[PDB]
Amino acid sequence: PQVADLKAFSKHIYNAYLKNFNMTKKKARSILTAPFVIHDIETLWQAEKGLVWKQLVNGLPPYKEISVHVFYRCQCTTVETVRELTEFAKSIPSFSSLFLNDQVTLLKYGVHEAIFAMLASIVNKDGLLVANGSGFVTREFLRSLRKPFSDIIEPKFEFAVKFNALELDDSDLALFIAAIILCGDRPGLMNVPRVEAIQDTILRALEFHLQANHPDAQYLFPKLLQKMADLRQLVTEHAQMMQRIKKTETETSLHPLLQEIYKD
């Protein structure tokens, strides 16, 4: 029953993944191998005028400085990805079967881990794609921002480069992300056994998918479990840096949805 049942299960989640995420790793890698390079104030200014963003510039807070503007651009991209992760989750029948409060709990504590995991898809050692792959913001430019804003993004690059060395494709990622969302460990969950059961099914689907898709990649599955653990620490460290900013930079605002996610 299992292997055939789980291949169908995997196929469905892969389809949900393709349906709800505009930028695939496949699409991203092709571009990363002709986007407009953002590497300083002038080119970002030109990008804001030239490129097509999902969130219009006039919708963002009034311009103060480059570091804070980038910080707001990060929030915009995050909120957009959270929107897609929500529809991705809702496109998974077992997820949508959960009570709505549990759905919210899983998304609340899950999306940032998933975002940092998916972030690698549009990242190389030199920078990351923005504006639907129309732009490419350099890693050095992001390093050049003033404290505390420069230190937030660099750890995500470090994780991504190691993560991309595993060479997962979109079919692997769909299951990997699904396993991050449907996680029985989240605080305040109502029906833990049910979520743990779904999570187990996804992980069994993944281990079989990896054997079929990556037959010669030894220890690939336990390595990915470790990355799931690593992502929890990355998010923990991220939340601390975000907290530092709210305290020290009282002038800067936080998007209301993100306020709710960080409410604790």
Ligand X SMILES: CCCCCCCO[C@@H]1O[C@H](CO)[C@@H](O)[C@H](O)[C@H]1O
- Residues within the interface to ligand X (CB under 6 A): 82, 86, 99-101, 104-105, 107-108, 188, 260-261, 263
Report the partner that residue 101 touches, choosing among ligand X, ligand 7T1, none (CB closer than 5 to 8 A by kind): ligand X
What burial letters (b/e) apply to 1-15, b meaning 16+ CB within 10 Å? Answer: eeeeebeebbeebbe
Shortest Cβ 195–ligand X spacing (Å): 13
201 is in the binding site of which of ligand 7T1, ligand X, none (Cβ under 5 to 8 A by kind)?
none
| SS3 state at 168 | coil
In the complex, the smallest distance separating the C-beta of residue 181 from ligand X, rounded to whole angstroms, is 11
Nearer to ligand 7T1, 13 or 235 (CB): 235
CB of 108: closest distance to ligand X in angstroms? 4
Put the strands of the sheet holding 127-130 in their side by side order.
36-38, 135-138, 127-130, 123-124
Q: Which residue has the tokens 């898809």?
A: 121
Output 82 or 205, the one with its CB closest to ligand X.
Answer: 82
Give the Cα separation of 53 and 135 in Å (integer): 10
CB of 101 to ligand 7T1, least distance (A): 21
Three-state DSSP class for residue 124: strand
Smallest separation (angstroms) from ligand 7T1 to the CB of 7: 32
Which partner in ligand 7T1, ligand X, none is near 263 (CB below 5 to 8 A by kind)? Answer: ligand X
Strands 127-130 and 123-124: antiparallel
Distance CA 104, CA 231 (A): 20
Using CB atoms, what's the residue nearest to ligand 7T1? 73
Calculate the CA 177 to chain-centre distance. 9
CA gap 106, 231 in Å, rounded: 15
User: Which lies closer to ligand 7T1 via its Cβ, residue 12 or residue 83?
Assistant: 83
Site residues (vs ligand 7T1, CB under 6 A): 38, 70-71, 73-75, 77-78, 115, 119, 130, 137, 152-153, 156, 242, 258
Toward ligand X, which CB reaches closer, 190 or 225? 190
Q: Which does 86 bind (CB under 5 to 8 A by kind): ligand X, ligand 7T1, none?
A: ligand X
Q: How far is the CB of 260 from ligand X (least distance, A)?
A: 4
Burial class, 46, CB count within 10 angstroms (exposed 0-12 / middle 13-18 / buried 19+): middle
